[PDB]
Design a protein around this ligand. Sequence first.
Ligand SMILES: Cc1cc2nc3c(=O)[nH]c(=O)nc-3n(C[C@H](O)[C@H](O)[C@H](O)COP(=O)(O)OP(=O)(O)OC[C@H]3O[C@@H](n4cnc5c(N)ncnc54)[C@H](O)[C@@H]3O)c2cc1C
Ligand SMILES: O=C(O)c1cc(Oc2ccc(C(F)(F)F)cc2Cl)ccc1[N+](=O)[O-]
Length: 464
Amino acid sequence: GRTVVVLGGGISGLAASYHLSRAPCPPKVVLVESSERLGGWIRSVRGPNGAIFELGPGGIRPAGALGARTLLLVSELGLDSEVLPVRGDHPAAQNRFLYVGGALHALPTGLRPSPPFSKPLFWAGLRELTKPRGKEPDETVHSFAQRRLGPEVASLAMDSLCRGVFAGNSRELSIRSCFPSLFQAEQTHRSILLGLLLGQPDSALIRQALAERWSQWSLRGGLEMLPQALETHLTSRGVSVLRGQPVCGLSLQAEGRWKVSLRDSSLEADHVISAIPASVLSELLPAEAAPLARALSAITAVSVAVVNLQYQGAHLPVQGFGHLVPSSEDPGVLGIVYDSVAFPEQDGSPPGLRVTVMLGGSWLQTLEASGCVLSQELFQQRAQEAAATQLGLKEMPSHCLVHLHKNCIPQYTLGHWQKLESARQFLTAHRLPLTLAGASYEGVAVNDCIESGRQAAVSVLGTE
Ligand SMILES: Cc1cc2nc3c(=O)[nH]c(=O)nc-3n(C[C@H](O)[C@H](O)[C@H](O)COP(=O)(O)OP(=O)(O)OC[C@H]3O[C@@H](n4cnc5c(N)ncnc54)[C@H](O)[C@@H]3O)c2cc1C
Ligand SMILES: O=C(O)c1cc(Oc2ccc(C(F)(F)F)cc2Cl)ccc1[N+](=O)[O-]
């Protein structure tokens, strides 16, 4: 007798529906997805020769309690046979690079001046402990990193790191919202290094991932198998999924029920879990909820072009996960991922070398805001020049895939904590049967989006 609608069929929406429907005494769950497919940015292409090309995340890092919570989900979905781990005894696990000064340079692990840093990194760690503590509520990743680590580390490492995780600009991103652990470390223990030196579910898959030290894992038919398995389960349990059915409007009525408004249809939800972009939810809210909508509309997302390239009979200069490209090296190219190093099983046959070029940054930000045309060709040449320049691959790619993802990665810029705090004070102040979830709020990683989903699910079952 209690209906919960879930908006968005991304991984957050999917996870929420999954936990809701698995409760001992489950409400009626309806999943509402605006596109033809579930899975949101998690999407995979099974090319001609049998190779997988990832269009979003290519694999997932299992480390952390969240890492472990996702491997459990995977066990529960009986996907174990299908898992492709990358084990601690491989280069794809023990090697991330930087393209700096026309060369790839290896980032250290824990073991002498390493290019492109002039001095040993031991020295920055030093002044790190002795350094004061920022007294502001928030701070940009650049400001933070620069202050505690020095100009070199900030301009190269943190700059790249923000690009690799958020496809974003570290002079924009909040250190509080982007690296909450680094931020609490510093705040709590007056020092990043200390807070780290001053510090989990279980199952067979996890024990194995702990033992073999998996640095990441993916699925054999591609990551999309995850949302695929999830959807199969929802549908089994009799959860109701509506594709190609965008939500147009939300509004409350009597008895405090929600009227979800479809194109030419409607649903009454007792509760609503929003797992769609915050900027979208914003446009769906009744003027009753202006101050919340203002908060939501303040959360924006960058775009990303993904270009997959496959080269027949080519080889890389190095073996690693991939490399990052600092903004000072290239505004448009964020990094390249060597998918074959990690997942040779997905190379097809005849097997071919696969890399994935991530395009974005200010290059693409300004093109979006221009009269210019965002052609496939434009992204193709960029990607190819990058592989040719940065990887010495001057062969024509035997295969090529180009995808522009508009507004796909939420940017947690300065003041983000406040936006969240405001949305959350409005919601509770007025006791709205609405829960928030997904990448717009408390993390963009798939691991985060899932926990995001589970927490919204749990909190919704708490209410009844
Ligand atoms: C190329 C790239 C690489 C990435 N790599 C990694 C990585 O490897 N590791 C990692 O952890 N994370 C990675 N991510 C980030 C991560 O994939 C995303 O943050 C996460 O998948 C987003 O999930 P979500 O459910 O929060 O949002 P989304 O996946 O965007 O889902 C939201 C859904 O809501 C739907 N929707 C919108 N409006 C409506 C409406 N009105 N009615 C009904 N439905 C609606 C949309 O169609 C969409 O499907 C990557 C992202 C990108 C794109
Ligand atoms: O660490 C990374 O996240 C890393 C990401 C790379 O590719 C991306 C994947 C995803 C995104 C995303 F999701 F932010 F768009 C950006 C980039 Cl550059 C390439 C290399 C690395 N790395 O550590 O060597």
